[PDB]
Amino acid sequence: HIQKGKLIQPFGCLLALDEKTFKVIAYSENASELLTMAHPVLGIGTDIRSLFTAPSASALQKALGFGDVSLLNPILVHCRTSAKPFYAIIHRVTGSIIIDFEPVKPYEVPMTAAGALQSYKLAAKAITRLQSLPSGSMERLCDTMVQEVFELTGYDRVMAYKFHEDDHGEVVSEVTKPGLEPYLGLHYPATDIPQAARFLFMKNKVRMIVDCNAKHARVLQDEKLSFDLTLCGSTLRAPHSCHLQYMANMDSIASLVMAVVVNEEDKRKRLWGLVVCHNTTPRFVPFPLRYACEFLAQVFAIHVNKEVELDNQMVEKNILRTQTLLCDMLMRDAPLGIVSQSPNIMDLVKCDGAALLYKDKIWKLGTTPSEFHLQEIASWLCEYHMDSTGLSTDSLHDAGFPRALSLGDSVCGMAAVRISSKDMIFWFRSHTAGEVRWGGAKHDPRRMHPRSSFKAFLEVVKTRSLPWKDYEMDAIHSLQLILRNAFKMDKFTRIEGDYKAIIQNPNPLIPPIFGTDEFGWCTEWNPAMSKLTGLKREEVIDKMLLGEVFGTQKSCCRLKNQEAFVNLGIVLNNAVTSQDPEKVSFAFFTRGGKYVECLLCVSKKLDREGVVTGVFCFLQLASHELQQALHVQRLAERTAVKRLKALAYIKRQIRNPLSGIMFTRKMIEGTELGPEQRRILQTSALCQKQLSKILDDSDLESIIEGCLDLEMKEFTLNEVLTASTSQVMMKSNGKSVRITNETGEEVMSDTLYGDSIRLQQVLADFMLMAVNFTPSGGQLTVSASLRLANLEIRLTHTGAGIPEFLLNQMFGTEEDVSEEGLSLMVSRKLVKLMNGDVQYLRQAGKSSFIITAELAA
Amino acid sequence: HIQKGKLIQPFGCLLALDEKTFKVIAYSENASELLTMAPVLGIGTDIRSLFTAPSASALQKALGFGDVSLLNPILVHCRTSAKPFYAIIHRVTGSIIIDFEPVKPYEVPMTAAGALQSYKLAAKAITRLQSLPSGSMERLCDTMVQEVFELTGYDRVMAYKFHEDDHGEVVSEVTKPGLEPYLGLHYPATDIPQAARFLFMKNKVRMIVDCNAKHARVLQDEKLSFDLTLCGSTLRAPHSCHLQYMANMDSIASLVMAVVVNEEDKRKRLWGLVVCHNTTPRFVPFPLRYACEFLAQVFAIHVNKEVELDNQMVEKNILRTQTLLCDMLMRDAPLGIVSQSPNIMDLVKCDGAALLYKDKIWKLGTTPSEFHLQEIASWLCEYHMDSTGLSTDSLHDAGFPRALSLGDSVCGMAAVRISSKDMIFWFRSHTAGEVRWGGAKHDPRRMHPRSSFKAFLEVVKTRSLPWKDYEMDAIHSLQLILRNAFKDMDKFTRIEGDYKAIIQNPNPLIPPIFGTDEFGWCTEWNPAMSKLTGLKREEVIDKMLLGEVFGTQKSCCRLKNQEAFVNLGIVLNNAVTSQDPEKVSFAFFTRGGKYVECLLCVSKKLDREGVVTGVFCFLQLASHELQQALHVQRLAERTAVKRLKALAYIKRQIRNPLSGIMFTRKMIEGTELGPEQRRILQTSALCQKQLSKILDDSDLESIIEGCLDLEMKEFTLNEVLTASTSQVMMKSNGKSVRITNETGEEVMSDTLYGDSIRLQQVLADFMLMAVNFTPSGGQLTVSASLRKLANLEIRLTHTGAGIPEFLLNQMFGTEEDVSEEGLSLMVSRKLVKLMNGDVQYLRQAGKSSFIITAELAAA
Ligand SMILES: *[C@@H](C)[C@H]1/C(=C/c2[nH]c(/C=C3N=C(/C=C4\NC(=O)C(C=C)=C4C)C(C)=C\3CCC(=O)O)c(CCC(=O)O)c2C)NC(=O)[C@@H]1C
Ligand SMILES: *[C@H](C)[C@H]1/C(=C/c2[nH]c(/C=C3N=C(/C=C4\NC(=O)C(C=C)=C4C)C(C)=C\3CCC(=O)O)c(CCC(=O)O)c2C)NC(=O)[C@@H]1C
């Protein structure tokens, strides 16, 4: 049924011919009407040449003679009768060649695309905008991809549908033109899409259905041999009745499904998901557009695959940071030092609280329960856990604890380790919320018919909190080893999904470490270094590290050349002089002849009284890609050291006279006067505070990304409107343009809660260019209305209006952005942060700005 | 021939030991007095009896070591007197030689006792050398010479450098004030005997303490069957001829350091020397002359990375020439070669160009007369028929009868013949070649050194720069292009070998080229691409370029993976719309396992009617280092653009509220104003005006260089002083600092003719940091004196210890970071210097004074 089925959609015709005789043997029922109806009859034994013109016949013959027909697929042919062009898509199967003919609509791309490259040309804008995006954001990539698919196809309600590890699908993004229901975040069972279709989407990467209720046309074979004739590869295949019923229940009758195949992991291609478009009315799309979409999907898959590895780099970067911090704590003494100094045990692993139980004393910091609660915790640990030195229970409620209920919500995520019989360490986490809105019946790992489970659902969780990862437990184990060694097996459990007795042994995380005397003799050579190099601590000790241990000839470890020797000496001397570790590239040859290339971090050793008593160094074995990225960043950043200095200088030289006007205004406000210039003083102080808070902002990218912090406080609309109008009265009077305020007294005197400074900035800039783009003698009317408080702001200014290129700039659809356009985008992003939008309206002689803001009243 | 020398310098002692039994077999006459005096030193004496047991214990360890050079300088005390000495040990064939040098009481304790402690003394010089941006050799040489000057402390330091003919040329020099410069002089190759050049590759540091000093004898053992070599010892005496040469140069002490670079065949090569000269006897401890052997090694490393950066400029020039040749490949006949924006003058570096086409002349710059062009063509035809191109550095030496008529305008010419009569000329102007050549002339025993180093000059005849090897290749490529285009070996002569005409053979520079029509089929596949890939043209043409020729399977050239296929399609489609030649990374496999990695450049094939007919692509075979450098530059440009936009953001959002403050101030002026409120109003106006001017400035480097145009106006000192004070008294109240003024009323009432904004900014900054450094409850007094042109002197005296000297050094402009405070200090000092003044810092017990001097106009 999904595989074969002598039924095809009726918007095209099909013809299956033999490999050698080039004679028709399978023909669709509607082929005669579509092709030869103004003559040979389309019956078994008819040729393909008779019913087509000489150039069309020659082109078809050449295409059939071609080896890889997948390149020149859209072969625009002409009927033997008057015109009637047809696209002539071609597929090959074992023993047969199937040609699908589709009518060519003259009003849309006639002869524009007749090959793979011309078809691919139709997605250039989408491809270049996908490429132009910055890296590091998967959700941004998905949103852009679905938005471009929606714009290019002309459908509605396009959606990205991602497959999880259990094959249950989840909607990730969506874009719809009207105000229909948003399908976003809903989860669907893994049985919605059968394994047959999922495997069939490995090939036939684009599937199209035009009408649900269209009467399918039968395809009749020949009664002679070669009964095998499969229609899986054809673009005219009748969808299965079950999916037909499902789509009918889903108030859609058209569909265009494109598979996303990520070619990563060790072929081994995996179906990441689908880009599904659903239409409530019949829709047809020319083949070049559907071939341009099978190319955009490949580009999207490439970008997703390349984002996965950028995500992967962060884990190893965090591991390197943890190793550095572990060495830092190794350089200290006593259990008091891990918590006393700045980088504490709260920084070893992400958490919300830390506790140390040392000799019947508690050192706690962060979100921790009461001391007696920890005492009962330790009593239960020493009463029921003797076989393990630790554990990681994500939910203390799930594990056995009589008093877990009364502990609270900010607890029950634990990681505990016993340094000794009594003295132990605890890491505590709070609760993390999480819920799902399953779109139907949960799969809970056919002739089933439709079920109409496209309604709603809700599932919640509890204080189970975030899971504890593996390298985190490795870090805690390494800290335990360090503390135990400093004082003078290691099996502990894990309780994740209430399954008891999950015993696992982790591995230490200590990096290779070596250390030299002040003269140069080698003193410290830890087992990790012995494993990495192959040497033994006994045979490398009381020797010169520069020249004997590391040397170009007759040395245990061989440096490549003399430049490495010079650089090693330079970094040793600099580290004895300079402060804090310096990372340098370091490469050598092992005893067995294997090249090793890592990073070296060196730092001075210290005694109890001042003097430097040697050098302590360790190696970071970063991966090759991280090393290249760090090297490129280091090389490139050497040319950019002046920009921050200039920025700081400008900030200082603006802050000084800003304080000067602060001080003069302090005098002016100090002396008592009448009301009007006191009001002017208040407005000037408000504008000057706006200037000051604009100054302290550091980076623009925070505003662009829409993550800027908001200061919430009281204000009134009258003062903000007056300040904004005052900021541009001078420019309004420069062009003699009158500005009027039609806001009512009730709205004007309203008291609201929000960020008045940003609102004043936005309104002042809008009024500013409204004055700019209003011809002299014109009028600009600003009105405000209040309706959770919704502030509606109308700016109606006379004149022709702002040119449309600036409009496409402010909407963010144009990459070429001017400084004015910079002001526009910043303003629009801030308005979006304020739960609103900025709109532009053009009428005869009047251009009007719509501003919508959300404020608390 | 120095192995026979048996004479040593008298500043130390030399002691030889037999390799087997560690007994004395050679002692200098100086050793008996230097060490023993407070047993008789003879043959076979036990070395242990010479020094104390704690001191002698380190010795046997040192001789027992494998590579003793890692622990050479050993502090040793004698057995009885316990006088400190530095011992340096080295090994000769069948013997161990030790040199003992007295330890000067400059620093008798601590110091260095190994090869790594001594290296520490050059850390500052190494850091300064490493912090220098790359690109120029002159900066490196001057920095190296300056650091040597600072470290050693000799009178003169020079960076003598060898040329190909082994003749030297001083490249840099930094001397004590006075004396006599030597920069630019050239010296004969006979000043450095080959023996010294060979010896320096083994002993990289050589010291002479006194040319005229009483020497000592080695007193070799009679029982030795071999002569004791003294070449490697640091106490070896030099040659008498070289002593006389030092006497002629008016120098006594000397400390030379060889520079050895690694030239790929790796082979050592003596790049040059670093020579230190002193007019008086001088002594330097061993650790310093071991930190100089390390600094020289670092300098040699850095002087071989400014040679690879010069092998990349040539490759970049080759790539640019190839791009320009491809540009001329698609053009309409001749007369578009000359008229269009890139012309023949951009092909090779020349001063003039000319084209002779069908008895007509086209010119593009400094060229001789048209009749002179016809005469040149006639002479070249009547004298050279078996050559299609010629290159002469000098036309007079070439044999041109009328070369003297041209004069200084043209000296060198490169010409090619596209047709029988039609030709192309590049003319390069005459340049002057002058060499100072001090001393004597260089032209390829008991000889005594010359007594005079007179600087007699040398000058060459009428000559220009020589035509390089690849310039002829570019000209030949243009010749081939025009020859092929006209239809629809060659034996170029290059007379510069000084042996009349020598005939060479050039090779073209044309890069691999291919091209497709609008449907994707291959249409152009040039021989260079065939050589690069191995595919003959007839095996490729009329095939789908993307999918059949370049594909991931069953294709002529195999791409690596699917991403390359997608990227190639994307580039081929984007080239039709963008039209720009876009360099993209390309990589493919040839017929046999060759992973070619190059740069693809694609451009459309727009025709006369304005309709495209395919694409035209060519590769650019570039080395990995050049590709990485281009990638790094491209990465940095985006960051620069982003930072520029980010900086441009803030100015508008500061200016708009500023405009608000201005409008409110005008409305305040419109309303009622009191007497003192009026004064506060003008102070606020002045301060906000200063803010407006400082914000509206866009280029700080304009002020830094000195191109800032000050706003000439009229003002008074009292108003500027009040405006500058009002900016800082908030911090004065923050630290409870009391500000006082002692200026006379006449100066306040005096009218000043100048810029008040800059003076106000400078004064505000000065009192700001003066209050910052003033302790709580302190005093800050301002005194202004005006003398009538009116000279103004301002004294700012504040309580406290004082501003640290590093801030003053940053003010004077002697630091890199400088810091916000230091940079503001430097800017204020430069602005005062524009007023022909300076900022002075005076320190007294509990007092610190800023002194500012300036001049203005008065009426
Ligand atoms: C006499 C036979 C000729 C001669 C002999 C000679 N020269 C050397 C060694 C050196 N000559 C040096 C020359 C220079 N140093 C300078 O200051 C300048 C110019 C400003 C020059 C040209 C230098 C340096 C050396 C290296 C040794 C050193 O101690 O500096 C020797 C070898 C001596 C030894 O150590 O055995 C000899 C035999 N040089 C001459 O120019 C005269 C004509
Ligand atoms: C029948 C009782 C079961 C069933 C069968 C079935 N489904 C398909 C194909 C598809 N199912 C799709 C599902 C979704 N699309 C959406 O919009 C969402 C969620 C938002 C879901 C879950 C899609 C898409 C397809 C592919 C359509 C296509 O044209 O390729 C098939 C294969 C039909 C075919 O013609 O190959 C079959 C047999 N699906 C069910 O939900 C029930 C349980």
Numbering used by the authors:
A (entry chain B): 73 to 110, 120 to 347, 361 to 539, 546 to 588, 742 to 1040, 1050 to 1119
B (entry chain A): 73 to 110, 121 to 347, 361 to 539, 546 to 589, 742 to 1041, 1050 to 1120
Q: What do the authors say?
A:
Phytochromes (phys), first discovered in plants, are red and far-red photoreceptors that are also widely found in bacteria and fungi later. PhyA is distinct from other phys and is responsible for the very low fluence response (VLFR) under a broad spectrum of light and for the far-red light high irradiance response (FR-HIR). In higher plants, phys share a conserved domain structure consisting of an N-terminal photosensory module (PSM) followed by two tandem Period/ARNT/Singleminded (PAS) domains, and a C-terminal histidine kinase-related domain (HKRD). Then, we solved cryo-electron microscopy (cryo-EM) structures of apo-AtphyA, AtphyA-Pr and ZmphyA1-Pr at resolutions of 3.8 Å, 3.0 Å and 3.3 Å, respectively.
Specifically, we well defined a small NTE fragment, the knot lasso (KL) in the GAF domain, the tongue protrusion in the PHY domain and the PΦB molecule adopting a 5(Z)syn-10(Z)syn-15(Z)anti configuration in phyA-Pr. In contrast, the 150s loop (T108–V122) in the nPAS domain and the 380s loop (N344–K361) in the GAF domain are completely disordered, as in phyB-Pr. Notably, the tongue in AtphyA-Pr adopts a relatively stretched conformation with its tip locating much farther from the bulk of PHY. The phyA-Pr HKRD dimer is essentially asymmetric due to a striking kink that occurs only at H1 of protomer b, resulting in local disruption of the symmetry. The most striking difference between AtphyA-Pr and AtphyB-Pr occurs in the HKRD dimer tilt angles relative to the PSM–PAS2 platform, which are ~30° and ~53°, respectively. In contrast, because of a smaller tilt angle in AtphyA-Pr, only marginal interactions are established between these two structural domains. The angle between the two H1 helices in AtphyA-Pr is ~30°, and there are no obvious intraprotomer contacts between HKRD–CA and PSM in either phyA-Pr protomer; this angle in AtphyB-Pr is ~120°, which is much larger than an ~30° angle in AtphyA-Pr, and intraprotomer interactions are established between the HKRD–CA and the PHY domain in one protomer and the GAF domain in the other protomer. Structural comparison revealed much more extensive HKRD–PSM contacts in AtphyB-Pr than in AtphyA-Pr, indicating its higher conformational stability. The lower stability of AtpyA-Pr is expected to be more favorable for Pr-to-Pfr photoconversion. This may contribute to the higher photosensitivity of AtphyA.
